[PDB]
Each structure stands twice: as C-alpha cells, then as structure tokens.
Amino acid sequence: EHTIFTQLKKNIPKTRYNRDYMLSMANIPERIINVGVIGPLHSGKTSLMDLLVIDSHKRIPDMSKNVELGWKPLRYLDNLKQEIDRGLSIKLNGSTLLCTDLESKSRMINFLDAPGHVNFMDETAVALAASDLVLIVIDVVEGVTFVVEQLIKQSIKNNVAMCFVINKLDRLILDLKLPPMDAYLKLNHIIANINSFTKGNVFSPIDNNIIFASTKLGFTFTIKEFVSYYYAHSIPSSKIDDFTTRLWGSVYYHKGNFRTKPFENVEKYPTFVEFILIPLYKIFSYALSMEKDKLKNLLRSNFRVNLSQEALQYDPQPFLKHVLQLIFRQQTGLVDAITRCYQPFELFDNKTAHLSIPGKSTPEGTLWAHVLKTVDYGGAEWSLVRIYSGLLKRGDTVRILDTSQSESRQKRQLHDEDDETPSCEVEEIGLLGGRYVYPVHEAHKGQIVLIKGISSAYIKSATLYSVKSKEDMKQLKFFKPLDYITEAVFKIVLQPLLPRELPKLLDALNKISKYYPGVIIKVEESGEHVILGNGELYMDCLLYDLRASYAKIEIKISDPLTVFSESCSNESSRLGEENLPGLSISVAAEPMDSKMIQDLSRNTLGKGQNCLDIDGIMDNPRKLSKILRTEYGWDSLASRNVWSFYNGNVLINDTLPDEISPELLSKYKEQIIQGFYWAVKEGPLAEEPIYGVQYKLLSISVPSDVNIDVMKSQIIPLMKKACYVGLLTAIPILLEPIYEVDITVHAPLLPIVEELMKKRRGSRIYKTIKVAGTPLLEVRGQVPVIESAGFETDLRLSTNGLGMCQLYFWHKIWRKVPGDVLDKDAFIPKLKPAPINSLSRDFVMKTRRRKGISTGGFMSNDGPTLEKYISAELYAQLRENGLVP
Amino acid sequence: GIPVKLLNEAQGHIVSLELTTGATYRGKLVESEDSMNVQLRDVIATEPQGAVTHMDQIFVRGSQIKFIVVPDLLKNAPLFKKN
Amino acid sequence: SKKTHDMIWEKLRYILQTQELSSTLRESLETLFEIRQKDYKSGSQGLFILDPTSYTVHTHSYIVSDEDEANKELGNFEKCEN
Amino acid sequence: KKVNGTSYKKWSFDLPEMSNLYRLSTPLRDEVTDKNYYYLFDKKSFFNGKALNNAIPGGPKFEPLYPREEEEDYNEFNSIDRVIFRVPIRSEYKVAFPHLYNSRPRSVRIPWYNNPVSCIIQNDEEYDTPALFFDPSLNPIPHFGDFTLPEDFAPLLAEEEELILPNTKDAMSLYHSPFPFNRTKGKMVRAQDVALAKKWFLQHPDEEYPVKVKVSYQKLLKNYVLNELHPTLPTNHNKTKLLKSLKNTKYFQQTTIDWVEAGLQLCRQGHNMLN
Amino acid sequence: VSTPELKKYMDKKILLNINGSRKVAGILRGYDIFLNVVLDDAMEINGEDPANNHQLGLQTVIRGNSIISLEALDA
RNA sequence: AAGCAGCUUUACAGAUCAAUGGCGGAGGGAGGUCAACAUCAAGAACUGUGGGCCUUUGCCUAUAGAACUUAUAACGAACAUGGUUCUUGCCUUUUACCAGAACCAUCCGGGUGUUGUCUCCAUAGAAACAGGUAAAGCUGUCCGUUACUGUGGGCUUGCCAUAUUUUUUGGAACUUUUC
Numbered sequence A: 001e002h003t004i005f006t007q008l009k010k011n012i013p014k015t016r017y018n019r020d021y022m023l024s025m026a027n028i029p030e031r032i033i034n035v036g037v038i039g040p041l042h043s044g045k046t047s048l049m050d051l052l053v054i055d056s057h058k059r060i061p062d063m064s065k066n067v068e069l070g071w072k073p074l075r076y077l078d079n080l081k082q083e084i085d086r087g088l089s090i091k092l093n094g095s096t097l098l099c100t101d102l103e104s105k106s107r108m109i110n111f112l113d114a115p116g117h118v119n120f121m122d123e124t125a126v127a128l129a130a131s132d133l134v135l136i137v138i139d140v141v142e143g144v145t146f147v148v149e150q151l152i153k154q155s156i157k158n159n160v161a162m163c164f165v166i167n168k169l170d171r172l173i174l175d176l177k178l179p180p181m182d183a184y185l186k187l188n189h190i191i192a193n194i195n196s197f198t199k200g201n202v203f204s205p206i207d208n209n210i211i212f213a214s215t216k217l218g219f220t221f222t223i224k225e226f227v228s229y230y231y232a233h234s235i236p237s238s239k240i241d242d243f244t245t246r247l248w249g250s251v252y253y254h255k256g257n258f259r260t261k262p263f264e265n266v267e268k269y270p271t272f273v274e275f276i277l278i279p280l281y282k283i284f285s286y287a288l289s290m291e292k293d294k295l296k297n298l299l300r301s302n303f304r305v306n307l308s309q310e311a312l313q314y315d316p317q318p319f320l321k322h323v324l325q326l327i328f329r330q331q332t333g334l335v336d337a338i339t340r341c342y343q344p345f346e347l348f349d350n351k352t353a354h355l356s357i358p359g360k361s362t363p364e365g366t367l368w369a370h371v372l373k374t375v376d377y378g379g380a381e382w383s384l385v386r387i388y389s390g391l392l393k394r395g396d397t398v399r400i401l402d403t404s405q406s407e408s409r410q411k412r413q414l415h416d417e418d419d420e421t422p423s424c425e426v427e428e429i430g431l432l433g434g435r436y437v438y439p440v441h442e443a444h445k446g447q448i449v450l451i452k453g454i455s456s457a458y459i460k461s462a463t464l465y466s467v468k469s470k471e472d473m474k475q476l477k478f479f480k481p482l483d484y485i486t487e488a489v490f491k492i493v494l495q496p497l498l499p500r501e502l503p504k505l506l507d508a509l510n511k512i513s514k515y516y517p518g519v520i521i522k523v524e525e526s527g528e529h530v531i532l533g534n535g536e537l538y539m540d541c542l543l544y545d546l547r548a549s550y551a552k553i554e555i556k557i558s559d560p561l562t563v564f565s566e567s568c569s570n571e572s573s574r575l576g577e578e579n580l581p582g583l584s585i586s587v588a589a590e591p592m593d594s595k596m597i598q599d600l601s602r603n604t605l606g607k608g609q610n611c612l613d614i615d616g617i618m619d620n621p622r623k624l625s626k627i628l629r630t631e632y633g634w635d636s637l638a639s640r641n642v643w644s645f646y647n648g649n650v651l652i653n654d655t656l657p658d659e660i661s662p663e664l665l666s667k668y669k670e671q672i673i674q675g676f677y678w679a680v681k682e683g684p685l686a687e688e689p690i691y692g693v694q695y696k697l698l699s700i701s702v703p704s705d706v707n708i709d710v711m712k713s714q715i716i717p718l719m720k721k722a723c724y725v726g727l728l729t730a731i732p733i734l735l736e737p738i739y740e741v742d743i744t745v746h747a748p749l750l751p752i753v754e755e756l757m758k759k760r761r762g763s764r765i766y767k768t769i770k771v772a773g774t775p776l777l778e779v780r781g782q783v784p785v786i787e788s789a790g791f792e793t794d795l796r797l798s799t800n801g802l803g804m805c806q807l808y809f810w811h812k813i814w815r816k817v818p819g820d821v822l823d824k825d826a827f828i829p830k831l832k833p834a835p836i837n838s839l840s841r842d843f844v845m846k847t848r849r850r851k852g853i854s855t856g857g858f859m860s861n862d863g864p865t866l867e868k869y870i871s872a873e874l875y876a877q878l879r880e881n882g883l884v885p
Numbered sequence B: 001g002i003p004v005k006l007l008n009e010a011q012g013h014i015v016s017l018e019l020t021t022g023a024t025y026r027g028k029l030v031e032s033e034d035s036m037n038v039q040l041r042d043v044i045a046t047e048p049q050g051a052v053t054h055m056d057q058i059f060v061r062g063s064q065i066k067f068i069v070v071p072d073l074l075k076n077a078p079l080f081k082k083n
Numbered sequence C: 001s002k003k004t005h006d007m008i009w010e011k012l013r014y015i016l017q018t019q020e021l022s023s024t025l026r027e028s029l030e031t032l033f034e035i036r037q038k039d040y041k042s043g044s045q046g047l048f049i050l051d052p053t054s055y056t057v058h059t060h061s062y063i064v065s066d067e068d069e070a071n072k073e074l075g076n077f078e079k080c081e082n
Numbered sequence D: 001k002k003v004n005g006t007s008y009k010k011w012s013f014d015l016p017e018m019s020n021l022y023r024l025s026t027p028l029r030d031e032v033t034d035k036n037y038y039y040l041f042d043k044k045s046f047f048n049g050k051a052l053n054n055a056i057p058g059g060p061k062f063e064p065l066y067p068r069e070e071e072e073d074y075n076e077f078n079s080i081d082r083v084i085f086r087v088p089i090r091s092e093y094k095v096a097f098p099h100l101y102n103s104r105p106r107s108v109r110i111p112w113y114n115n116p117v118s119c120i121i122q123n124d125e126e127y128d129t130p131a132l133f134f135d136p137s138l139n140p141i142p143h144f145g146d147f148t149l150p151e152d153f154a155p156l157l158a159e160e161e162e163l164i165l166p167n168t169k170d171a172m173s174l175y176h177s178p179f180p181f182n183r184t185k186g187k188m189v190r191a192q193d194v195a196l197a198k199k200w201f202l203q204h205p206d207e208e209y210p211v212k213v214k215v216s217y218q219k220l221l222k223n224y225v226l227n228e229l230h231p232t233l234p235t236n237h238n239k240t241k242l243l244k245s246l247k248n249t250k251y252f253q254q255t256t257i258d259w260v261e262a263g264l265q266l267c268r269q270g271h272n273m274l275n
Numbered sequence E: 001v002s003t004p005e006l007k008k009y010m011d012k013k014i015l016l017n018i019n020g021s022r023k024v025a026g027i028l029r030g031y032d033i034f035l036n037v038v039l040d041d042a043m044e045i046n047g048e049d050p051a052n053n054h055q056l057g058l059q060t061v062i063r064g065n066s067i068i069s070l071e072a073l074d075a
Numbered sequence F: 001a002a003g004c005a006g007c008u009u010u011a012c013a014g015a016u017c018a019a020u021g022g023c024g025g026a027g028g029g030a031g032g033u034c035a036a037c038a039u040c041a042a043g044a045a046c047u048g049u050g051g052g053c054c055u056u057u058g059c060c061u062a063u064a065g066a067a068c069u070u071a072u073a074a075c076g077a078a079c080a081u082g083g084u085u086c087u088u089g090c091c092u093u094u095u096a097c098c099a100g101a102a103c104c105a106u107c108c109g110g111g112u113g114u115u116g117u118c119u120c121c122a123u124a125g126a127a128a129c130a131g132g133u134a135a136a137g138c139u140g141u142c143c144g145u146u147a148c149u150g151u152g153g154g155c156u157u158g159c160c161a162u163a164u165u166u167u168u169u170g171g172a173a174c175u176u177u178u179c
C-alpha cells in the first residue's frame, strides 16, 4: 500500500562483485565518494540510476520482460507506491554501489537521486548536503532553463563539485531530426550556457566534466571513454591523450593532420562531429533501417561487437537499446568523471565549514555524524546520516542534538556540564539499496548509511556525536539547520472530520514534519492546524500520506491560502504606555531599503566580494558598522546601535537614556530583543510575520525601584505591544509572496500563454527565451501565490499538453497587496473575487477570522486599529488631525 | 597491466614495500603511479640491518622496489576475473 | 518554388550559427527565422483587385543577367507622322 | 519466415512491410503520439471523476459513489467570512490534485503527473525531404604540424558513406508510432480483440460535431471506464472446454466446409430443434 | 609519459638518499618526468650532524636514476 | 584492422600410428486452428542443494537455477453475463428491468513447461556394448578428427617503436674476516 520493497534477505539481488570487498573499501576515506544526482523535472535522473543498478547486480526480481527490453523504464529508486502512480520522484532515495573507472580502480560510491520537481527542492538540499559532488543531469532539448541555473548556483554555494550529464540525445535525433552539424551547434550552445553560470570553472568534454547520455536507450559516454574503447587501438599510445584534446572545439581533421581553419576543397565537419556524432547517428540510422545481416558485419568491423541470434529478432526499440548497450559497454566513463572531478583536499574542509562553523579538524577519537533527514524507508523509520569522523557500531550509544538547538549550543560552547543532550542507541545499521536495506555491523567515516533508532530524538535534522573526554567536547562542531531552498509559503488549514480522531491526526502530523523536511506545521490558537507547503503538487503528495499512509482518518481541508507579511510605507507625540505608569516605551517604524531587504533575503549582508553572514553578524560589531555605513549609507550613530537582525527586520537603539545610562539598558537588552522576537513572529494586522520594517527604539522609562523578577517579566509583553504602535502609526501595508514562473511552451502557443497571464491578477511576463534548436520557447514570469491555484493545469488544458510551468519561491519576492489595509468602506463581494482596491482589506479580514482575532456574527469588521493598544483619549486626539482614520 | 592496476587497488590500504636496497617500508599508501613509484604515509621503516624508525611521509622511486605486499582481500578484486 | 527556396534558407541558416555577424544586422536575420515558424502571416496582405483569370497571365520571365534594352528614349518627345 | 506456420501464431515482419501497413492504416490509426494529449482524459482521471462525482467536459457521467453526501456539520470552518475567494476551484482542479482540492476524497486514485513536453518533428509534405532536416518552426542556433596521426586513420563507420538510408524516414515514423506499428513481431490476436473504433472515443471529438454524437462519445467512454474499473479475472482450473471435450467423444466427427454452407446447416438444424 | 606527483612537497625541506650511500637534504624547487629533482641550499648529511655535513651549492639538480627514496621532513 | 608472431580450428602431407589428452558421437529436423498433464496474482512474492540451532516444522548461513504474467500493475493492448446483499430508478403484481456498490461465480479466450501423437523431409552411425530412473551419452567401455609440425581461414592477443634515468641489451667485476 505504501512502497514496493524486498523484505526477505534471501531475495535481495546478488551483485557482480561480492559486496564484502565493497565494505572493505569503506575503511579508506579517500576510496569512497558521495555523488548525489540532481537536475530538472523528468531529466532522466532515476533512469540514470537504472543503468548503474542493473549493471552492478546480476538479476533483479522486480525487472520484467518489458523492462529488460527497451519499452518501460525500471524506476528502481522510485519504490514508493505514489511515485509509481505519479510517474515522479518524490522522496530522496539511493543505492550504494562498487564502481570502477577507466583505470579499473574499484571504489565505493554512494548515489542519491534527488527528485527534480521544483516543489521538492527541500529534498535536493539534503542531496546537496550529503554529496561530495553533484551529478547535474540536463536534458538536451530544454537545455539550461532557469531551474538549471539555480542548481548550478546552489552547488557553488554548498562548496560541492559538479559534473554535468547531457541527457536525452535520442530526442536530438529521433524527435527533433536535427542534422549532425545542427546538433553539434545544439551541444555547443548548452555547454557555453553552463559555463557562464559556473563563474570560475570551465566545463568541457575534453576536461571530462561533461558526459553525454540518452538514458531511455541506456547508454552514456564521455569522449575519453569513447576514444579509449575504439580509437586507442589505432593510434599510438603516446597520442591518445593529445588526440582526445583535439576532439571537441572547432578543430578539423583530414588525412592525418589537424587544423583550426576549414580545409579547402573538402566538405568537412569538426572533429567531434566526424569522430563521434557521425558514428553515433549511423548507429541510430542503421539499427532502425539497415538489414540485420549487413549490420552484423559493420559491428564486427568497426566496434568488434557480435549481435546475438536472439537479438536479431528484436523490435526496433529494444534492438536499438541492445546495440547501444553492447557498444558503450558500461558506465566506466561516468564513474571516471565522478572520480576525476572530486578533490577532497580542496572541498571537504570547506564543505564541513559550510554545514557547521569554520574551525579546526576534530580528532579521530570523536564520532561525529550529520543526520540528514528521517526516511520512511521500506516500512520502517530510518535516519539518513553521513559520518564525518570516527567509527560507529551497532548497539552503541550516541549523543543526538536536534539542529534547531545547535545555534545556542555552539554559542554556549565558547564559555568566554551535564544533561546536555538526549541519548539514543544505534539499533540497526544498513546501506540504502533502492528496493532494499543491506544490513551492516558498523559504518565508517565518509559514507551515507541508514540508522534505525535515531529518529525520536530530533525533528527534521540532527547532529550525532559520541565524545570520549570532557575536554574533547570543547572542540566539537554543531551543524547549522539545513538550507532548504524554497520557503514553505503555500498554506493549507485543516482539522479532522471527527473531533475524537484528533490524537491520531497529531500523531501523523509529527511524522510528516519529520518525513517532509520542507514543511512548516504549526497549531493556531483556535485549534486548527496550519501546514505550509511548497506547491500544489507538494500538498497533494503530503495529504495522500496524511490520509492514506500515516492516519486512516478523514479530514476537513480549506482552500489554498498563503502567508502574508506586514510592512509599512512611511516613517512615523509617538509613544506607548502600560496601565501601570512604570513602563513607557516609544517605538518608531520605517521601511527598510529595497537593496537592504533583498540582501537579507539572500541570507548574507554585503556587496562586492565582502559579505557578513547572519550567524556571526553580531560577533563583528566594528565590521558591521563598516558595512552598514559604507554600502547602504546609514548614519554613524545608527550603525553602532543596531541590536539584532531578526528575519527581514532590524532594531536600532535611538534614545537619550542610552546616552545617559546604556548599562541600565544592557541588563534589560536581551529581553527587549526577546520581546522584539515576540512581535515579529505575530504582527499587529492579522497575526502575520513582519517583514522589512526598520524599528527605532525612541525612548524607554525605568520605574522608581528595580525588580529583576517583575521588570524582567513585564517589559517583554509591553515591547511587543510597543512595536505594534510603531508599525500601525507608520502607514502599514500587507505583503504577499510572488511565485516565479518558468513556462515551457511551443512557439505558436505563446499568445495563449500571454492571455492566460492576463486572467490572473498580478502576473507579468518578464523574459521570453527562444530555446534554440527546438520548436518550444521558455517563458519566465511571476505570479502571486494566492493567485496560483490551478495555474499549472489552466496552462496545460489551454495548450493541449504542449505547455508546462514550474512555480517556485527561491528569490523571496514579497510584494505589496494593491489595496489599502485600513478601509472601513471597502467593498468585499461575497462568493466573488473582490476588486483590486479591496485586496488589502479583504486578505486581512479573512485572516483575522481564521485566527479568531476578529469575531463577527456573519461579517463584522473591527479592523487592525490603533486604539486597543494606545489610550482611548489619545485616539480621539488622533482623529481630529486626520492622521488616523 | 593487471599488476599495476592492483597497486591502485592497494591505494589507501596498509601496504608493505621492500626496496632493492634491503629496507622495508610498511605503512599506508597516499599515491601510486604506472611507473610504480609509491609514496606512503605513517610508514614504519626497517633499515637493511634492522634498525627501525618512523617517518611521517615518504616517496620511493619505482625502480628501487623489489616486491610489494597488498591487502589479502584484494585477491577477489573485480578486475582480476579472466572472462 | 519550395525546393530552391528551402535551399536559400539552408545557406541563410548557415549564416547565423556557424559564422560571426554584426549585431544589429544579426537580430533582424533571426527575426526572419521567427516569422518562418509564424508562417509569414504579416507579409501577405495587399491589393489583389484582379482575379487570377482576370489578370492575363503575362508572367514575364526576365533574368537579372539579361542586358535589358534600357529604353529611356520613348520618354523623350518625338514627332509622329503616324 | 513471416509466421511460425499454419497454426498461425507469433508473426514477425521486416521494416518495408511494416511501414507499408502503417501507410494503408492511416484512416484507422491513432494519429496521436504524445501522452500529454490525454492529460485529464485518461482512465485515472475518469476514475476520479466517478469517485468525486465530478464531470470532465468530455468524460462520462456516473451515479454518486457516495450518495450519502447531504449530511453536514454546522461549524465555523468553511464559512464565507473565512474563505478568501481568488480563483474558482474548477472540477479540473479537483481531478488533477484529488487530495488538495477535495475535502474527504475516498476511493480516488493518484493520477500521473506530466510527461516531458513532446517536440516530435514529423514531415509529410514531400518524400524527397531528407530524414534528418532542420525543420522550420525550430528556433535557430545563434552562437560565435603540431599534432599528426598516420594517414588512412579514419573515424568509425567511415567506409560506409551514407548516413540516411532509404528506409530511415519510414522507420522513424514507426519508432514514434503507437502500438502495434512500432513493433515488428508479436503474437496473434483474435478478430474480436482488434478494437478499431476504441481510439476514436478515447480522444476528444472536436467542437464541430453535433450534440447527438457527442453523447455517443460520452456514452462509449462510460462503458470503457466500467470495464477497467471492474476486472473479472479468469480462473485457471477451467480445463474442460466444450469443443475439446466433444472432440474426444466418438459421436462427433470433423471436416472442413464452406462458411455459407455451415451457416445454412445451422439454420436448418436450429429450425429442426425448435420445431 | 606521466609526471610524478611531488606537488604537495615542493617548497618543503626534504631528505633523499642518492644511489649507493649518500643522503642529501635540501629545499626542493623542480621535478620532471624522470624524477630529476632540483633543490636549493643542499647539504650532504653524514654521521656527525654539524661536523661532517658540508653544503653543496646554491642550486643542485639530481638525476632521477640515482634516487632510492624521498622523505619530506616538514608538514 | 592490412602485414609478422601467439592461439583456435581447418582441407589436410604428417610425427605417433601405442598408452594417451581435447572436443564431438552412443536412435534426427521442421512443423500441427493435435491431445494429455502441470502451471499462471503473491511478505516483490520461487525452487533445488550443503551447513548450524531447537526437536520433523521453523530459523540462520552458503550455493545453483528461475519459463510465462505484472508497475499509469496483469495471462486478454480484448471485454460479456449470472447469483446474493445494500442503496436507488421505473410504479398496476411478478418476471424482465433502472444504475451504483460490496462479495462471489459462470462463459469466450491466452501464455509457458514437459510428454505423447500426427504430417512432411531425412541418412550415416562407431547409432558398437553393458547398467537404470519419471527423463537422457545418465555412467562406464568406446569411436570420428586428433594430443607435436608446415601451408590455407578466424581472433579472448602484441600496444606501432625494438639499446640512450622507473623494468628486457647489464654498475659490472674482485678480494677479506668469522663460523
């Protein structure tokens, strides 16, 4: 009902190697490497794992007669039942394989294919943190689309090597029917398009960074593999390394000598066309058309390849796959690219310094591992872990710290004792194997394994350490919470259909928050349950497992919603006051700069090869005042008195008692900021987060007498009340998230897409790229997330299947909702979409009634108003001037 | 040839190399080349007359080596099979 | 004349991809390719007053390699004893 | 060589014979090569529209799977002052994502997501157009003594001079063709089992058809869904067939006669039975 | 054919034994495919460390044929 | 891959013309709108064989073989009917019906695996002998070329550079103590 999975040990498929020699290679850290397979939607990633699994194993019981032939793929690493039905990877999966390169050096390689759909961009952030090098699989037709660009930008960010797989070369000949020079210009266009995004490293088929593949026909090759099979016999052995460099890149060959210019009097192609593409297209042509007796002689004469008597009575697609698998014999050129690209001396210290804090290398006595995610792998709850130091055996006891706690634990590690971390026992260790788990007694350094018995100690990620001495605990590093790229911004509110089934819902929602790491599950004060998701497909995959796999209950579910953010348009006798006169705190608000907001969304503050990350942004206050004054042009006083950057927001101390007694403020500073955190999390308008508001603490009053006990506990609710008075006075607005859209349609069907973008509300097409060589073109635009309900299927039905869009939230575009948020006279029509001037009033009033903050009979409007916080006698004074409505 | 290929299999594996000068270097293998010159880490060195020392890193020219001892497990290494 | 015309495109297509071209000229060249998929529906409107059998089909088969008699002289004045 | 023998099973053809049958069959073939045409018109969406009691605009209409629907809970959950109204949730939204746009879906089946956007260039105007040809509507591609090998060193397949063979344009039409024309061998099927008209109502008709024949497309789809939804599997122990067990008896003999002769006998015999 | 990989060592003080008996320790600047190694500030080590030691020259080059083993004293 | 060598065979002239060793041979090939018997929907699932535990079963471990059917799940790229029960529809009673469900069946069909039969085409035997099963060169004995050459074909081969620092065109040679 959930997966397909071989439970029996005796039915696990045997391998060509003996699998104990593979685990013997786990002892050497340099021997083993971790490559994770990423790419766009339907790029051929799981099919690339089909080629690596069935050539590692001798007989797979799940492979059928249609699958042994060409007709249907073995999506072996799509073991989930929903993944079989969707035709789609959903969960991260992997298989550990022993693989030899072109120099026949066998080594243990841990593969992990990420799902390529853009709503599962949380699963590939696990694959970016696990892997030493990413094997980015690109289809040749769509080329370098905008989701390819981010997968190049993320791999540079994660300090991870990369190696590009150009896939689907059958579509380049069988679908598109390009002439061989016209397809060489296609391949040269894509490689020149990935070299602009890899800002340092040049990528080229000479440099063994690029592998050509057509995975439905089941082959892959570099140009180094192809020379070493069929051209190394003819030319001298000192020439094979210089010949393969004269192979790509506008250099021509005729009768024994090479030129950059074209030969006169001779119709001649480049050396890549004549030596590789012309031999490849003849294999495509002759396996489909040439007689099987005449073709059998050409495969012995040129490829030394014997066609079987059973293979000649094949259908044209299995016969084309059988020839292309009997040429291009193994994936030794893929593995040689994975071997030659990864350099652990350059990258593994920077990769560890990016997942945790930068420091010296931990000693080998420390066991130290990174728990990537919790995996529901084969009817059990496993933990996906990567070991960075030490040795872990089955039955040991380890200290497992949840990563959300690791911000404070790393900060409290400095110290200018006991009960620090819960302890769980390593119940069982296995290797992920696709449709099975292979049990192992221990797990060495550098390899991804699956451990049962860890998952209860944490949510959504963990760090695993087992330290020997207390002095050795001082130097261990804690990992940072995982950078899932897309923010969970697509919102669904649910409750169970029956009230007595609520504990079974809360049990299943705690599983989904573990299993789906890019979700944000929260419980409102009204008792409803909010799930924040990535898209329509990410919610539909989530709510399948919630209704079928993890709780058998039926649940009520609202329409798609979004998260809103709160902000202001201008800066604004401004004071705040408690019923007791002992506390008087005045707070002003101001919009932050657009460049200052856009850089804090990129998680780092700076410009031009000088930037300060948000984690150590307090630890250099002299340098922070240099960055704020130079790059954005703030005042010198405002640069020195900034207290904290909470998410998208800033607090500045601007008061005269700070010039009088800053030490009296410094003992109360940590709880003003704690109360500042208590106000940004739920703002004054609709209990929504605050984004892009420059707070200025104007004044603060300290009562006669001091109580740490009472003054400490009273200022935290009052500062949250005082931040509301500053924002509401400062012409508040409502923000909405903006999906970016990546449409692929055929070129005649573009005016359908332009009219389809006009039916939505805040949609605009910004860029229209002619995807070269293809009939289709790439359309890049934007849409609000509250408007993008059924956007994906309105596009497909209107273009009759020749259109597809990816909706994503990489860039954190928050845009002002077009209405005015304080409109008592806004016309909200029932059952119809309200007009464009009524939008900020509508979205707040409905949100305040989901939360229960505003309670009406049917529709009673008590707006977010500046009178329940400030005194009512002052509110009447604000009406007569025209400042407050 | 297979014998050198096997040396690549040795890589990262505690291996013992006897020089034609008579010494014995047992330790981990950092790198190897088709020439066969081998460089080791944490080698325990035995001079020809038996005096034993310990050296952090080492490189030995291929021509010098008389024989190499490699991990016993390597024997069932995948490449070896004739067919 | 589809067959020879297609040959004109194929040489024309060889211009853009395998050869280097001045920029402003080049964008106009690929626009022609764009119209080609778009099928020419904005080069096909005009004053077809005459039916295809009301225009007497004097399709003059003259080649731009023929010295063509440059008859400026009948636009001069003369003297008809006719 | 084309069949096993006069038992007439397991045929196998060559490429020119297979493309020739492909060309004769173009009145009755499928004429659709992408699976993105059948997006909300496959049988998984047809099962969901029955289970959710929705109507695809060309698909069939059924009875409610759960006709006890009119019960409701008086609650503040789905009220109008709660719901933001931006996009009307269509029935195509409910079927594409059955677990998102449906409160309480049950007996629904997970649909297939997209396939990659099929860009298959076919060429039908001229036989003399080559098999590999830079077709119009393709976007153009705008871009941009030291070492010596011995002479008569050649690339692979250099002794074979031509890339396009005279059957390649035929064979690539067959490669992207639906079943059974992409095959060259296969088992025999019965004359009952060759559904020539099944592919017509599995497609959208067109807007041009009248209303009495668009019902015939919907009503034949409804019989298609109910056969797929309720499989009746055959049991294996049925080893006694009727004609085989009467052949074993001495009271039945065998010959070959004409069909019209055997029809006239069965009319004479069946008249003699009822009379 | 293939260049020996000394790449990490270069710029590090190295001891190496040459041919029959001799041991020479010096900073290493260059290596080639035959292993010919050129190092600066060369010193010929002997039994008595300060005494019998004599420097060779500002730059010394070594034929790769006489190298028996190379050990780098340093990081 | 031309050419040379190695290998495998081959028309063979052989050595032996023995004891040998290798491969082949010790009752065919294609079929049939022929038949019988198994088998065809399940922890992604099978069976034989060896070893250990408990006391045969079961488990663990080692190994060999897996035809057909199946992943947008099913022998059938096809598609009818019946029974019961629940809920509706038609609205004199019943039958025959309406159209959804749940559980079961019948009917038209299909694959594969052995064995028997039938039809057509067959002839080198050394297809000679002795044992026995549910099956057979299954085993022993055995015979054909033959295990060691040269000519003629093929390649599981050479790494196409064969003396000038990491391998095979020599840093070799000589003398001395102890025991």
Ligand SMILES: Nc1nc2c(ncn2[C@@H]2O[C@H](COP(=O)(O)OP(=O)(O)OP(=O)(O)O)[C@@H](O)[C@H]2O)c(=O)[nH]1
Pocket: A039, A040, A041, A042, A043, A044, A045, A046, A047, A048, A073, A075, A087, A088, A089, A090, A114, A115, A116, A117, A167, A168, A169, A170, A171, A213, A214, A215, A216, A217, D116
């Ligand atoms: N023509 C052609 N089609 C291919 C090729 N590789 C895969 N496909 C098809 O493309 C679809 C996508 O392939 P997948 O194996 O699912 O690759 P994927 O990137 O893992 O897809 P996701 O699950 O979304 O991540 C498959 O249904 C294949 O049929 C190829 O090399 N050539």
Ligand SMILES: [Mg+2]
Pocket: A045, A046, A088, A089, A113, A114, A115, A116
């Ligand atoms: Mg995938």
Ligand SMILES: [Mg+2]
Pocket: none
């Ligand atoms: Mg009666």
